[PDB]
Amino acid sequence: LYFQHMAKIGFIGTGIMGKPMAQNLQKAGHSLFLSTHHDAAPADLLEAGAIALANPKEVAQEAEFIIVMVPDTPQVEDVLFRKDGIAEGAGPNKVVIDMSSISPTATKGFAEKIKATGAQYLDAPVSGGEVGAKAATLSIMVGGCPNTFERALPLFQAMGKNITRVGGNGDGQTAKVANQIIVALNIQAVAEALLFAARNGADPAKVREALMGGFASSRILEVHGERMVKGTFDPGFRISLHQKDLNLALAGARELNLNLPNTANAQQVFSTCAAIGGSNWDHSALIKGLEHMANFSIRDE
Amino acid sequence: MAKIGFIGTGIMGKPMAQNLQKAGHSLFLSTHHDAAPADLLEAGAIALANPKEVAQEAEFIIVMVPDTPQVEDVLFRKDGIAEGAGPNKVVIDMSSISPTATKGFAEKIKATGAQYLDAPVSGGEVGAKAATLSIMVGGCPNTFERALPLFQAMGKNITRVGGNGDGQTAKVANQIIVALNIQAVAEALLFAARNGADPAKVREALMGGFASSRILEVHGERMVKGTFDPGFRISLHQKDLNLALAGARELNLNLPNTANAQQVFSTCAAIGGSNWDHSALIKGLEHMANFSIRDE
Amino acid sequence: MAKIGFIGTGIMGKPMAQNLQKAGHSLFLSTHHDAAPADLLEAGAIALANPKEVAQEAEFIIVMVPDTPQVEDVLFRKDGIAEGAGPNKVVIDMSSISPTATKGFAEKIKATGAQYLDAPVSGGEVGAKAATLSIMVGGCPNTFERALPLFQAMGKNITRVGGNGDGQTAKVANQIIVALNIQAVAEALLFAARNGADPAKVREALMGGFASSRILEVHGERMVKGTFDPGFRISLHQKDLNLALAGARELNLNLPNTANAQQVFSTCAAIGGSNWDHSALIKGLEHMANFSIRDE
Amino acid sequence: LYFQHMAKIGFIGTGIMGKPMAQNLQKAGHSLFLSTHHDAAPADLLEAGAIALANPKEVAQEAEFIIVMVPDTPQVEDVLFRKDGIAEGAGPNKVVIDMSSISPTATKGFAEKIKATGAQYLDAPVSGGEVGAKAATLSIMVGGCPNTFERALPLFQAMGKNITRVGGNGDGQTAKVANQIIVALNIQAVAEALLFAARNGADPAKVREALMGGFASSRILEVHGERMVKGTFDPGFRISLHQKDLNLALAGARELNLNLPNTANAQQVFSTCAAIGGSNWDHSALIKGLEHMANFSIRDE
């Protein structure tokens, strides 16, 4: 309830997701604090009043909330615990919110190390992509203390639509890995289906249009399915990043004794995509690896 | 408007036939296989001896039986649909059968003067009752336009994919997505529960994002709640996946997820689950991990 | 000793029949399908019009044709083996066909007074020529003992697995191992070559250890040297894997490696390889990695 | 040729493989030097004249050749580069021979760091198991300088039968990963086949006996195949260790863009084995996970 008042929020990682999320936080009337350590602060954010400090430590000192939107597990560790990082600037009454898609197992240790400074920790990765981040319609899956979650909820509301506390620390990251298994497999599912249909001489565009509103309907079918048919593979979410995400699921499966045959196989098909020069294609281009495997394309190009 | 015949008034047939009556259509049932549903009789449907006498009377004849042999038999056996079909009549196969055989059945039906549409559906018993099924159709555009108002009374998203066989192909493609989407939710929820997270909260958390699907909404809820009473039985989906895998072998396709999904349904069948709803694919993966996402 | 009939003197049949002559057996060929190999004729083999006249003359009738329908036809068609078979005659199916259908064919052959053994082989064209084939047999122990000296002339490791059908089951199991062992060597060599290591040296290095196999020795050498001219064609092994995958679906078995191997052979077929020797499964995996273990 | 003269060889890691290999080196007339840092020297080796020093550094100082037989990649790094490790005791005219089954990619870096001390490096992992180690019939696949290889060849001859220089540093480890892909997949192959045969009512013992001498013949069929039928799963090579090995193949596949569907799937089936309490069963017990998946056992117990 309280954060209808201005909030002091630091934002570490202003990428294709971080920049629109920080922009949306500023539109809800909040004060943004940036780190210029790796990259210069975007002029869009400086114009809206963001204070560009020199490093994550200084950011953690000025701000009450510190959001991290970086690519992977080792980068969160470095940003949190390197010299002049978030832990050195954190203490009581401060909330460190990792919105990156990292290891759930590692997150538990990061949460303990941050809480050892008197600060609180939330793991709140998102779903919805760049389009979702700009629209503030992201699904935010949170892991942490229920009072910390409620305290940070008005901020999550400015960045997303469905916000949910899955459980304690590590759970928000476990919810993002589960998301990542679904996303990658729903893509593989639509690709195999359209490849089968087009191989039998059925127009894949008509097939995808016909499946909407039934048991095969999904956001992947309407979004990725259209990209597969139209060949619009310009990265939204790179195959190299989804391979990083599936590695978390498969590492978890190895440690916790899970037999996930389709998650294991989507990782192999993503490698066919990379082998034909596709690490930086959007993950919808997973169809191109299946087309390579079939010696048949669903497109006329 | 229109007199309609209906062979196969089962779990999907009866509610689809019921919605045709409400729309102002006269129905003609066949009591050769079994007795006509009293609900339909009490509402105006005429019972007839066989699909030939039904075809003779009706201008539109819908078929809804379990597999390719059963469609073949009801179309071309003695006293079947073809014998009573002819000029101006339209045969509509709304069953989910082999796209390959459909082109042959359509050819033989057209040889009587009649027309043929292959219009399988998606949306389960629920969607048939509520008339929100997605109906994928293959056949002549003029023939599709004639049957379109009947399709509108049975479903919501109606679409002509292409010529004859293309409707059945869209259905195989649908069954690949249904099985693989069910396995994605099962693998994802088993990963979550195994990590100590609540699968009920994870399912709720993923709504509105890229992981959003009709499967996460319906079948995902069944996985969390343990509600596996058949809507669509595993033994039936295994038959649907065989159509895809036979077609992939014939057309030189490498579909590894679909192939894995067939092997997983086999584990479900081995542990006593041939008649569970296809959402119980999670039970096969759960067995594979010696760990269930639910209690007791 | 013994008069022997031989239907199917092809790539495997002709050398097996040849070795029976050398052992002191009189052969009876059928010229219904095609002309008798001149090599066999010049060595004493009598040509006859059909498998019935061959069965009438011989006490042992060996069959070696490509699949289940072809065995069914040659056994039970007009002028086939059954018509001329009877008391004291023994039908030996050395083809690799469905274990399921074999029990039915055996039952129908016994109904003539004759006996039946299902004795498929392993060891390729090479092993047939050199008489070192491993012969897996199903049937009556007394019937197996009668045919044993003939088996000894055609192969080296002779074994009765069980009753009728068990020989064919051992062959399906053999084909699962052959395909999966070929894919293990292909995946292993592709991993090695991809890491900049010489696949020729890696194959040599692995001999004598736990990775030692007949496949690493024969098929591994073909993968390194690029010698993919058929011994056993991919389209044939795909049919063999379908027997295993149909049986797994029927018996509620989850065989994920075998299922993956079938999907990989499909990539080989898509890139023009239906007639390559099964060692060219590496070519499918190589295509899947955009990287070949050989040059040019 | 020269090492028909006594050699000074250090042995770091005296496990189920290390102890018989060190014993066989001593029977060829060589001097063994042990480290008592983690474990006490086995009395079998001390009786044959092994000098038990205090740590890998001291061992590298006294011996000309230093063999390492430890479980995995991080343990080789620790043994080679920790305080009082092999690198601190190494210099010119010294050969460090890693016989462990570790990452080929990491090995290249370990080789460079060791060569920076004036010492030479060989990566010579083996195949043949405990039975092979005792019999000195192991297949030794070596990676390194051809002169270093020839110099160390009489020592490899006392420990094994087929010794081969695959290539330069990293290649011996790449040859062991290729070995590990074959071993795990040949086991999965025999298990699926015997499970299929037994499911159809054919005696699996007769089936395995029938397949020998044909295209399905292998060491896995004669060795592991008999264990599958007889249920003798007492560890020779633990499933947990083969899962470590397949992780190297799958990590390599992810980095180098390989689609290896059966290596990926054997890793999932090994997890079913672990899930039912099998991390310490012999890898032949991979059949038990397939039996769990089929709800059917090939045995009467």
JSON list of C-alpha atoms in Angstrom, two decimals, chain C residues 226-295:
[
{"chain": "C", "resi": 226, "resn": "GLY", "atom": "CA", "xyz": [33.17, -42.89, -45.78]},
{"chain": "C", "resi": 227, "resn": "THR", "atom": "CA", "xyz": [32.35, -46.35, -47.14]},
{"chain": "C", "resi": 228, "resn": "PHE", "atom": "CA", "xyz": [28.53, -46.34, -47.04]},
{"chain": "C", "resi": 229, "resn": "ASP", "atom": "CA", "xyz": [27.62, -48.71, -49.92]},
{"chain": "C", "resi": 230, "resn": "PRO", "atom": "CA", "xyz": [24.86, -50.98, -48.72]},
{"chain": "C", "resi": 231, "resn": "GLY", "atom": "CA", "xyz": [25.48, -54.07, -46.75]},
{"chain": "C", "resi": 232, "resn": "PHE", "atom": "CA", "xyz": [22.20, -53.40, -44.88]},
{"chain": "C", "resi": 233, "resn": "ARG", "atom": "CA", "xyz": [20.09, -50.49, -46.28]},
{"chain": "C", "resi": 234, "resn": "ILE", "atom": "CA", "xyz": [18.59, -47.78, -44.02]},
{"chain": "C", "resi": 235, "resn": "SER", "atom": "CA", "xyz": [15.05, -48.31, -45.44]},
{"chain": "C", "resi": 236, "resn": "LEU", "atom": "CA", "xyz": [15.37, -51.97, -44.33]},
{"chain": "C", "resi": 237, "resn": "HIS", "atom": "CA", "xyz": [16.60, -51.09, -40.80]},
{"chain": "C", "resi": 238, "resn": "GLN", "atom": "CA", "xyz": [13.76, -48.53, -40.49]},
{"chain": "C", "resi": 239, "resn": "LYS", "atom": "CA", "xyz": [11.30, -51.41, -41.13]},
{"chain": "C", "resi": 240, "resn": "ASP", "atom": "CA", "xyz": [13.09, -53.52, -38.43]},
{"chain": "C", "resi": 241, "resn": "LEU", "atom": "CA", "xyz": [12.87, -50.63, -35.95]},
{"chain": "C", "resi": 242, "resn": "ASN", "atom": "CA", "xyz": [9.12, -50.31, -36.71]},
{"chain": "C", "resi": 243, "resn": "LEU", "atom": "CA", "xyz": [8.69, -53.98, -35.55]},
{"chain": "C", "resi": 244, "resn": "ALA", "atom": "CA", "xyz": [10.32, -53.01, -32.24]},
{"chain": "C", "resi": 245, "resn": "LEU", "atom": "CA", "xyz": [8.36, -49.76, -31.87]},
{"chain": "C", "resi": 246, "resn": "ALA", "atom": "CA", "xyz": [5.00, -51.39, -32.74]},
{"chain": "C", "resi": 247, "resn": "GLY", "atom": "CA", "xyz": [5.78, -54.14, -30.18]},
{"chain": "C", "resi": 248, "resn": "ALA", "atom": "CA", "xyz": [6.76, -51.54, -27.55]},
{"chain": "C", "resi": 249, "resn": "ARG", "atom": "CA", "xyz": [3.47, -49.67, -28.10]},
{"chain": "C", "resi": 250, "resn": "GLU", "atom": "CA", "xyz": [1.50, -52.92, -27.81]},
{"chain": "C", "resi": 251, "resn": "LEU", "atom": "CA", "xyz": [3.38, -54.17, -24.72]},
{"chain": "C", "resi": 252, "resn": "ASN", "atom": "CA", "xyz": [3.54, -50.81, -22.88]},
{"chain": "C", "resi": 253, "resn": "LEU", "atom": "CA", "xyz": [7.31, -50.37, -23.18]},
{"chain": "C", "resi": 254, "resn": "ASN", "atom": "CA", "xyz": [9.19, -47.08, -23.03]},
{"chain": "C", "resi": 255, "resn": "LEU", "atom": "CA", "xyz": [12.26, -47.49, -25.29]},
{"chain": "C", "resi": 256, "resn": "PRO", "atom": "CA", "xyz": [13.45, -43.90, -25.84]},
{"chain": "C", "resi": 257, "resn": "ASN", "atom": "CA", "xyz": [16.79, -44.68, -27.55]},
{"chain": "C", "resi": 258, "resn": "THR", "atom": "CA", "xyz": [15.11, -46.97, -30.15]},
{"chain": "C", "resi": 259, "resn": "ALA", "atom": "CA", "xyz": [12.44, -44.29, -30.74]},
{"chain": "C", "resi": 260, "resn": "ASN", "atom": "CA", "xyz": [15.13, -41.60, -31.22]},
{"chain": "C", "resi": 261, "resn": "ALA", "atom": "CA", "xyz": [17.08, -43.89, -33.60]},
{"chain": "C", "resi": 262, "resn": "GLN", "atom": "CA", "xyz": [14.00, -44.24, -35.83]},
{"chain": "C", "resi": 263, "resn": "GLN", "atom": "CA", "xyz": [13.72, -40.42, -36.03]},
{"chain": "C", "resi": 264, "resn": "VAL", "atom": "CA", "xyz": [17.43, -40.12, -36.91]},
{"chain": "C", "resi": 265, "resn": "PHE", "atom": "CA", "xyz": [17.17, -42.73, -39.77]},
{"chain": "C", "resi": 266, "resn": "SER", "atom": "CA", "xyz": [14.32, -40.48, -41.06]},
{"chain": "C", "resi": 267, "resn": "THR", "atom": "CA", "xyz": [16.80, -37.53, -41.34]},
{"chain": "C", "resi": 268, "resn": "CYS", "atom": "CA", "xyz": [19.11, -39.89, -43.32]},
{"chain": "C", "resi": 269, "resn": "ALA", "atom": "CA", "xyz": [16.20, -40.76, -45.65]},
{"chain": "C", "resi": 270, "resn": "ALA", "atom": "CA", "xyz": [15.28, -37.02, -46.01]},
{"chain": "C", "resi": 271, "resn": "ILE", "atom": "CA", "xyz": [18.83, -36.13, -47.13]},
{"chain": "C", "resi": 272, "resn": "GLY", "atom": "CA", "xyz": [18.79, -38.82, -49.89]},
{"chain": "C", "resi": 273, "resn": "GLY", "atom": "CA", "xyz": [20.00, -41.77, -47.81]},
{"chain": "C", "resi": 274, "resn": "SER", "atom": "CA", "xyz": [17.31, -44.51, -47.81]},
{"chain": "C", "resi": 275, "resn": "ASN", "atom": "CA", "xyz": [19.69, -46.92, -49.60]},
{"chain": "C", "resi": 276, "resn": "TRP", "atom": "CA", "xyz": [22.94, -46.11, -47.73]},
{"chain": "C", "resi": 277, "resn": "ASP", "atom": "CA", "xyz": [24.31, -48.85, -45.41]},
{"chain": "C", "resi": 278, "resn": "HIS", "atom": "CA", "xyz": [23.00, -48.32, -41.81]},
{"chain": "C", "resi": 279, "resn": "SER", "atom": "CA", "xyz": [26.54, -47.08, -40.86]},
{"chain": "C", "resi": 280, "resn": "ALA", "atom": "CA", "xyz": [25.55, -43.82, -42.67]},
{"chain": "C", "resi": 281, "resn": "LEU", "atom": "CA", "xyz": [23.32, -42.99, -39.64]},
{"chain": "C", "resi": 282, "resn": "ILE", "atom": "CA", "xyz": [26.41, -40.77, -38.78]},
{"chain": "C", "resi": 283, "resn": "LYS", "atom": "CA", "xyz": [25.51, -38.74, -41.94]},
{"chain": "C", "resi": 284, "resn": "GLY", "atom": "CA", "xyz": [22.14, -37.90, -40.40]},
{"chain": "C", "resi": 285, "resn": "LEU", "atom": "CA", "xyz": [23.75, -36.83, -37.09]},
{"chain": "C", "resi": 286, "resn": "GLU", "atom": "CA", "xyz": [26.46, -34.96, -39.10]},
{"chain": "C", "resi": 287, "resn": "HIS", "atom": "CA", "xyz": [23.66, -33.08, -40.93]},
{"chain": "C", "resi": 288, "resn": "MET", "atom": "CA", "xyz": [22.09, -32.34, -37.49]},
{"chain": "C", "resi": 289, "resn": "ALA", "atom": "CA", "xyz": [25.43, -30.71, -36.44]},
{"chain": "C", "resi": 290, "resn": "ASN", "atom": "CA", "xyz": [26.33, -29.08, -39.83]},
{"chain": "C", "resi": 291, "resn": "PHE", "atom": "CA", "xyz": [29.66, -30.90, -39.48]},
{"chain": "C", "resi": 292, "resn": "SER", "atom": "CA", "xyz": [31.11, -34.06, -41.08]},
{"chain": "C", "resi": 293, "resn": "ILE", "atom": "CA", "xyz": [33.84, -36.27, -39.50]},
{"chain": "C", "resi": 294, "resn": "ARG", "atom": "CA", "xyz": [35.49, -36.72, -42.96]},
{"chain": "C", "resi": 295, "resn": "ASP", "atom": "CA", "xyz": [36.78, -34.25, -45.66]}
]
